[PDB]
Amino acid sequence: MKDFLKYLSTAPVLLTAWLTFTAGFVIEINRFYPDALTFPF
Amino acid sequence: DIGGLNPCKDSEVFQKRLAKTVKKLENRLKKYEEGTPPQIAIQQQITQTKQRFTRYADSNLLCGNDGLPHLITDGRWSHGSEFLLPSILFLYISGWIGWVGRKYIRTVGQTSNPTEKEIIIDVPLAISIMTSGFLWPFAAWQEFLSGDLIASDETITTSP
Amino acid sequence: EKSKAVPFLPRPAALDGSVVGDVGFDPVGFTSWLPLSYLQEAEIKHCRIAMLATLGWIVADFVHLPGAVHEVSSLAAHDVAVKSGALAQILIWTSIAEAISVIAISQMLEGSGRQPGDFKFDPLNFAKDEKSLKKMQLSELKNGRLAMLAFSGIVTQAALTGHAFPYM
Amino acid sequence: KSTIVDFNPVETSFEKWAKPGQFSRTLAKGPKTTTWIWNLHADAHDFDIQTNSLQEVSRKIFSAHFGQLAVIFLWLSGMHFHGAYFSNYSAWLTNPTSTKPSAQIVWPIVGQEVLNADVGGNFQGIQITSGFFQLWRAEGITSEVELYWTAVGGLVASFLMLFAGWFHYHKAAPKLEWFQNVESMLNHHLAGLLGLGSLSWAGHQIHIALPINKLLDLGVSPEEIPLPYEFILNRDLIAQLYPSFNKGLTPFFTLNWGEYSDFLTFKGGLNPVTGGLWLTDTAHHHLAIAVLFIVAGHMYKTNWFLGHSIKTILEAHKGPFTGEGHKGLYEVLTTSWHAQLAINLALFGSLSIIVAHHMYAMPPYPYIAIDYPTQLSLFTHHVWIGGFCIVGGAAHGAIFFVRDYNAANNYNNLIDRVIRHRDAIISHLNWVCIFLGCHSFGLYVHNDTMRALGRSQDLFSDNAIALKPIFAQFIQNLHTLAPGSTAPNALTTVSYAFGGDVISVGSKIAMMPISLGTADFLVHHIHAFTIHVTVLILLKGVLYSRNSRLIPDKANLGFRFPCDGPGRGGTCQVSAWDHVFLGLFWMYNSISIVIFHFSWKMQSDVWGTVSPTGAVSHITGGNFAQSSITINGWLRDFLWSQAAQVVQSYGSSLSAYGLIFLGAHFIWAFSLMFLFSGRGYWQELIESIVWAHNKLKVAPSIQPRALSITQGRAVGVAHYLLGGIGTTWAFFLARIISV
Amino acid sequence: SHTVKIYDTCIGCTQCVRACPTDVLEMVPWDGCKAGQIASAPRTEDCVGCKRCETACPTDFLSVRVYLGGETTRSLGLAY
Amino acid sequence: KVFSKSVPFLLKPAGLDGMVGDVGFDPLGFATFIDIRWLREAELKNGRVAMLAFLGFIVQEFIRLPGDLYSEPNGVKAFFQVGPQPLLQIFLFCGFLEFNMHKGKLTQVDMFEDGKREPGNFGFDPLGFGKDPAKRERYALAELKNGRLAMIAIGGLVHHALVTGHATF
Ligand code: CLA
Ligand code: CLA
Ligand code: CLA
Ligand code: CLA
Ligand SMILES: CC(/C=C/C=C(C)/C=C/[C@@]12O[C@]1(C)C[C@@H](O)CC2(C)C)=C\C=C\C=C(C)\C=C\C=C(C)\C=C\[C@@]12O[C@]1(C)C[C@@H](O)CC2(C)C
Ligand SMILES: CC(/C=C/C=C(C)/C=C/[C@@]12O[C@]1(C)C[C@@H](O)CC2(C)C)=C\C=C\C=C(C)\C=C\C=C(C)\C=C\[C@@]12O[C@]1(C)C[C@@H](O)CC2(C)C
Ligand SMILES: CC1=C(C/C=C(\C)CCC[C@H](C)CCC[C@H](C)CCCC(C)C)C(=O)c2ccccc2C1=O
Ligand code: SF4
């Protein structure tokens, strides 16, 4: 698991993981607080 | 008020839009049976539509002659939650991203194989830099003061 | 040559004698393309899981925890426990244990020296020297295989015929 | 130490996963510019340049095939799982003519739940145009549990294919001699794969699909239909529907095959209940195909003194006009993967197009002819796949000519003689293309300008100068007369498209005689012209891939290169790749015209509803005959008219089709940036951007470079194809689902 | 005919001469570099303008430069 | 091989040697790809914050302040009733403290760049407990253990208030 972790450190895998996480928290914010046109405050 | 607009809480066309959307959703709801998942989904749609319209009405939002919320982005703090606060939020987040990217580029740029560490990210160092971007406004106005933010004449130029 | 278990089959060539519960039983040669330590760890994990599962199935069809949710047969207990969140806690703690297991099996495969299935969990002794440890390892392996087959039979019979503890 | 395989050739390790570009000698040193990243993916599957041994390339290809089949099995498992869990298949079974097939539900986020349409059967979801419901019904699948088990089997099969690929690359890789047993491979693929697959499917149809579908058509609900295994254990559940199983297999072994006429029929036409082909006819067809393919598999000599040698067959086919004939072709096709890929891809795309035609022509599934979205989608998809595969076959023929072609081994054979007179071929094909384009399109333009000038009697129309496709009408007449005259054991024509009665299921037309007039003449000649121009581009690429009068050493520049320079007046796109690029464009044009012709002709002169008294009213109303003869007619009565549903889809459950319409327009227009521009401008703009980055100390170590000329062309053509095909996709789907 | 010029940044690596498809360039004696040789363009009437010569040039901004000019049946690569 | 003392079936983790809480507990090896000094600083700060927050729960449900705003025995509901104005002042005060206690260097890459900074050592000791070095190690270990226990307990109390809603009691 020394080269597998290095493989997971490559640009495509890291970008895919980061974009999946990013889309995930964006989608979940929009699920829990939907239809947010202005700042909540 | 501003620009001839009126608050959406007193806009008749806004309430007409809400009523028409709710009526369409209820007509769609009529063609399903009992407490079946389709009816539950349509009822959730109706509830969310009503909640969204109510929130937009009670939001200091100005509606035009079409009954749609118009954004007042001239800079006034009265409508500051429409553009100014999201503007500050995005500026913070994007400055964070740019700062951590620049810091990672400059950090692995002083190693033996700078190009290797760009396709194969040093995840420990990347995590170290990324969580340090919360001070990007302060770090930027501490590196610009020291002259470490801008190159001067080592930058390359074309022939003319 | 001529493995002990199947006397007309050749020895699996990866199980000579130096493993507990090694009667040379690998006709389809699973050990010829998989690490022996990995397979041993998987077998011991299955043995322990199925022993706990057989005991729990049999006991829960007799004794129930207080509460209306715990008043179902073990065959129908999965859909009730998952809804109540009872299996969620087991899943969480089993996942923690299995992540630590990921680390442990990786270290064992890459050197270390940890025997397959050896978590050093031994509050009491029950195994003082090498001979006692080998005998108890053989007992654990045999009991685990028996319990795996027993749980298989119990589940298949209970699903076929929705009977109580006697699943005949 | 087997004689066919090598044991443990490559170690299973993750070390090379952490070294991108390890396969290439040039990319292994690591990236220095952003061109390395693009070169990494462009050379990933180019196994010819990664190893110098044909054995290693063959082993890599074999394992890649296993990975592809695992991916296909995973896709099929996903389809079956969606049918089992997120579909209204059970509701559609009880009401095939009034419930729209849906097998994908959409989560309620950001307001996207509007996409869950009213498909019927107390269900909300996206209407499915892949025809899986009809296929599953034809398979006898009457429950979603069977779909779940098929999905589980698909997952298991996908894992098995993954394991097979790993095994045959890392544990037991076959040798070159094993791969070069083309006689044995052909024998097995013809007998085992094809024939035994047809035989097994005939068995399944006869024992499962024939009784279950007969009960379904009789009105028996799926819940009271016996489970499929009961039709095998009980010879009385199937002997009531087909009273010939009571005799068992004795008629088969006693050559009294006439007894099996109950379930092995030859009827033709369509089932009046479902609108599809008679499943007894389908079972008989698969049985005959199985026998024919099994017989055909005993042709080539493999391991006994029996069969043919393909080398001896080819070498004996010489002639006065062809010199050495087919001598050396066996060596070409047993030492070059690219030649095999060319032949297989060309014939595979042609087969896909033939499949697309025969699908709608003779609907083979129950209640699929009346599902117009399914028919349109299946035809368009299969024709698109066929065109792409044909262009790929041409590309790999060019690749073989550049790389694997040996001049010494092909002295005076067919390949040599074709290259020796490539000029004549290309010049005459050029003349034919000009003739066909001039005629077809200029007849269209003449019709347009005569209509614009108020001279309606000067058009190339039916009520004007008429170009009747007499040859095709003669064939149509011959087929409708075949039952009883040339096919005396047929009860009905193969397809009602050639003529006959209007077949309607639930007041919806399934099939109907497709009349051919002057409008079909013009569009058929347009098809011929576009196909000829695509062939011209691809054949010019293949023949001039090695040398020309411009560049006498074009083979030394490789298959993929941008140019030879601005000299000779300009030597852009002289490659053979740049011909597969232009040919891709022209294939897009041809296939777009083909699918437009299909959509308009079907909607205007086949599909529609039938009144109880027998009056046929079509979707558009027969406007194809008189308004498809001018370009303004195509623009207005087809594009503008049938685009109404796409543009008015906002706020409805088809709004996703409008969004994809707009996005595909955007992507198609985006392509033109890469297609029209050049690399130097973008490199010099990146220069100033890099200056800004250096000024802010954020210039990347991997130097950013503009996409190479060939990659710029590839990006342009890929975006162009995606945008155009997506625009047509959204247009077709929204139009044919709305109406 | 096109114009081909050689500049004293030439290192005499001969890659231009062995890349010319029409035998325009040749190596001639020189004393301005280690190799003691410099490229020459004595047959520019055969120059086709393909610029293979300067694709093989290793010097920083080239030592052989091709300036496209008047066209000829030789420079246009016309076999007809 | 040494094997860890806490997790006896795992190899001894690296980078924990000279620490005041070393029991060899690092199965995931977080100390290998994260600076151990930063990890100890973060552990100590999280522990101290959790201890203060647990004490805050227990006092809030018991004592509370006079006023309509400060009248919720439930900490989770008190977070909402108190309004944003009192909370934002706490946020800004904590930020001021963070800035002045670390003297500018606040980030993972900036802190411990020059060394000479014992993890968690702010020099805060007005009452003088810790002059004797003999009990200093015991006090450090006690602080670490109490901080970890308080992290677990702070999570427990917060989630009890969420699933029940009344209080901790
Ligand atoms: C494979 C292991 C396993 C699994 C998945 C289950 C699962 C289940 N059991 Mg169960 N059980 C088990 C073993 C298991 N049991 C054993 C070994 C016994 C004998 C003591 C019991 C005795 C038992 C009773 C008496 C009852 C259940 C019940 C139930 C159901 C709901 C409540 C619950 O989780 O049990 C609660 C479990 C217990 C109270 C005793 C568990 C004792 C454990 C298994 C032994 C110690 C092992 C140790 C903690 C392992 C550490 C894990 C590590 C990752 C940290 C649920 C389907 C209830 C039910 O609804 O019946 C239908 C019920 O009334 N079980
Ligand atoms: C009757 C025997 C038989 C059968 C059924 C097949 C079937 C197949 N061969 Mg194959 N082959 C055979 C004999 C056979 N071959 C012999 C004797 C040789 C030596 C000359 C080869 C050499 C060969 C090569 C070099 C390649 C194939 C490929 C293929 C696949 C073509 C893809 C396709 O149509 O998808 C249809 C897919 C299916 C119907 C899925 C089910 C098929 C499963 C996997 C059964 C496969 C039968 C297998 C030979 C049994 C061996 C089991 C093993 C334990 C010994 C297909 C699965 C190509 C391929 O895709 O590679 C993987 C390929 O590149 N074959
Ligand atoms: C059985 C089918 C098959 C097979 C095995 C191959 C195999 C090969 N081809 Mg080939 N080809 C095929 C079909 C096939 N092709 C078809 C149908 C065409 C016509 C378009 C071509 C056109 C073609 C050209 C023009 C070239 C090849 C080349 C190659 C070789 C290298 C491929 C490579 O590294 O790409 C690696 C894979 C990629 C780079 C993937 C690129 C991504 C694609 C372009 C976009 C796909 C988008 C997708 C549909 C999703 C879009 C949806 C959107 C919403 C996101 C390899 C031998 C090249 C070569 O040098 O051969 C020696 C070469 O120059 N082929
Ligand atoms: C609408 C745009 C358009 C048109 C009209 C054409 C036309 C043609 N292309 Mg094409 N092409 C196009 C777009 C178009 N292309 C695009 C976008 C691409 C990029 C991929 C290509 C790429 C391409 C390639 C790669 C090739 C062609 C070829 C051809 C020719 C096929 C032979 C033929 O039919 O000639 C007949 C001419 C026509 C049908 C045009 C209309 C002529 C009218 C109807 C009749 C005559 C009118 C009369 C003379 C007017 C006189 C009056 C006037 C003096 C005032 C033809 C000239 C092939 C070729 O060279 O020819 C064999 C070929 O190899 N094209
Ligand atoms: C207690 C605990 C850990 C305790 C460990 C302790 C104290 C000891 C710590 C120390 O010794 C060490 C280790 C090392 C020393 O150097 C430090 C000290 C401090 C000395 C974890 C709890 C962990 C507690 C957990 C994980 C609880 C999870 C609960 C869940 C998921 C509940 C879910 C539901 O309630 C919902 C959400 C909805 C309901 O309807 C359904 C259900 C399912 C019931
Ligand atoms: C799960 C958890 C700890 C889990 C610990 C585990 C499993 C430990 C296991 C072990 O110890 C054992 C068992 C034995 C050891 O030998 C080994 C290990 C393995 C080490 C802590 C959660 C800890 C969770 C915490 C601390 C959460 C705190 C939440 C807060 C403060 C929320 C505040 C808000 O919610 C309000 C109040 C209002 C909202 O609207 C706004 C916000 C601000 C979001
Ligand atoms: C813009 C342009 C460039 C510059 C284009 C570059 C440098 C491509 C940059 C791609 C970025 C860096 C990655 C892709 C980012 C996308 C957002 C990802 C694709 C979207 C996914 C959904 C697939 C050329 O190099 C070029 C070369 C030859 C002819 C025309 C052109 C040309 O038009
Ligand atoms: S760059 Fe474009 S134009 Fe200049 S030569 Fe290469 S291809 Fe022809």
From TrEMBL, chain A:
Claim: Signal is one of the keywords in the record: no
Chief localization: membrane
Any one cellular-component term (Gene Ontology): photosystem I
Gene3D superfamilies named in the record: Single helix bin
Any one GO biological process: photosynthesis
Places the protein is found: Membrane; Plastid, Chloroplast thylakoid membrane
Membrane topology: Single-pass membrane protein
Keyword Thylakoid: yes
Keywords from the UniProt entry: Chloroplast, Membrane, Photosynthesis, Photosystem I, Plastid, Thylakoid, Transmembrane, Transmembrane helix
One Pfam family of this chain: PSI_PsaJ
HAMAP family: PSI_PsaJ
Job description of the protein: May help in the organization of the PsaE and PsaF subunits.
PANTHER family: PHOTOSYSTEM I REACTION CENTER SUBUNIT IX, PTHR36082
Family membership: Belongs to the PsaJ family.
Record's protein name: Photosystem I reaction center subunit IX
Species whose genome carries this gene: Nannochloropsis oceanica
Automatic annotation (TrEMBL), chain B:
Positions of transmembrane segments: 83-99, 119-139
Keywords for the protein's UniProt record, in alphabetical order: Chloroplast, Membrane, Photosynthesis, Photosystem I, Plastid, Signal, Transmembrane, Transmembrane helix
Name assigned to this protein: Photosystem I reaction center subunit III
Lineage, broadest ranks: Eukaryota, Sar, Stramenopiles, Ochrophyta, Eustigmatophyceae
Pfam families referenced in this protein's UniProt entry, alphabetically: PSI_PsaF
Family: Belongs to the PsaF family.
Protein role: Participates in efficiency of electron transfer from plastocyanin to P700 (or cytochrome c553 in algae and cyanobacteria). This plastocyanin-docking protein contributes to the specific association of plastocyanin to PSI.
PANTHER family in alphabetical order: PHOTOSYSTEM I REACTION CENTER SUBUNIT III, CHLOROPLASTIC (PTHR34939:SF1)
Gene3D superfamilies: Photosystem I PsaF, reaction centre subunit III
GO cellular component: photosystem I reaction center
GO biological process, one term: photosynthesis
Organism this protein belongs to: Nannochloropsis oceanica
UniProtKB/TrEMBL annotation, chain D:
Molecular function GO labels: 4 iron, 4 sulfur cluster binding; chlorophyll binding; electron transfer activity; magnesium ion binding; oxidoreductase activity
Gene3D superfamilies from the UniProt entry: Photosystem I PsaA/PsaB
Intracellular or extracellular location(s): Plastid, Chloroplast thylakoid membrane
One Pfam family matching this protein: PsaA_PsaB
Binding-site residues for chlorophyll a', renumbered to this chain: H665
Any one Gene Ontology BP term: photosynthesis
Catalytic activity: reduced [plastocyanin] + hnu + oxidized [2Fe-2S]-[ferredoxin] = oxidized [plastocyanin] + reduced [2Fe-2S]-[ferredoxin]
UniProt-listed Enzyme Commission number(s): 1.97.1.12
Family: Belongs to the PsaA/PsaB family.
Subunit structure: The PsaA/B heterodimer binds the P700 chlorophyll special pair and subsequent electron acceptors. PSI consists of a core antenna complex that captures photons, and an electron transfer chain that converts photonic excitation into a charge separation. The eukaryotic PSI reaction center is composed of at least 11 subunits.
Protein name as catalogued: Photosystem I P700 chlorophyll a apoprotein A1
Automatic annotation (TrEMBL), chain E:
GO molecular function terms noted in the UniProt entry: 4 iron, 4 sulfur cluster binding; electron transfer activity; metal ion binding; oxidoreductase activity
Cofactors named for this entry: [4Fe-4S] cluster
Record keywords: 4Fe-4S, Chloroplast, Electron transport, Iron, Iron-sulfur, Membrane, Metal-binding, Oxidoreductase, Photosynthesis, Photosystem I, Plastid, Repeat, Thylakoid, Transport
Main localization category: plastid
Gene Ontology biological process terms, A to Z: photosynthetic electron transport in photosystem I
Annotated compartments: Plastid thylakoid membrane; Plastid, Chloroplast thylakoid membrane
Function as written in the Swiss-Prot or TrEMBL entry: Apoprotein for the two 4Fe-4S centers FA and FB of photosystem I (PSI); essential for photochemical activity. FB is the terminal electron acceptor of PSI, donating electrons to ferredoxin. The C-terminus interacts with PsaA/B/D and helps assemble the protein into the PSI complex. Required for binding of PsaD and PsaE to PSI. PSI is a plastocyanin/cytochrome c6-ferredoxin oxidoreductase, converting photonic excitation into a charge separation, which transfers an electron from the donor P700 chlorophyll pair to the spectroscopically characterized acceptors A0, A1, FX, FA and FB in turn.
Xref: HAMAP family: PSI_PsaC
Protein name per Swiss-Prot or TrEMBL: Photosystem I iron-sulfur center
Annotated source species: Nannochloropsis oceanica
Phylogenetic classification of the source organism: Eukaryota, Sar, Stramenopiles, Ochrophyta, Eustigmatophyceae
Gene name as annotated: psaC
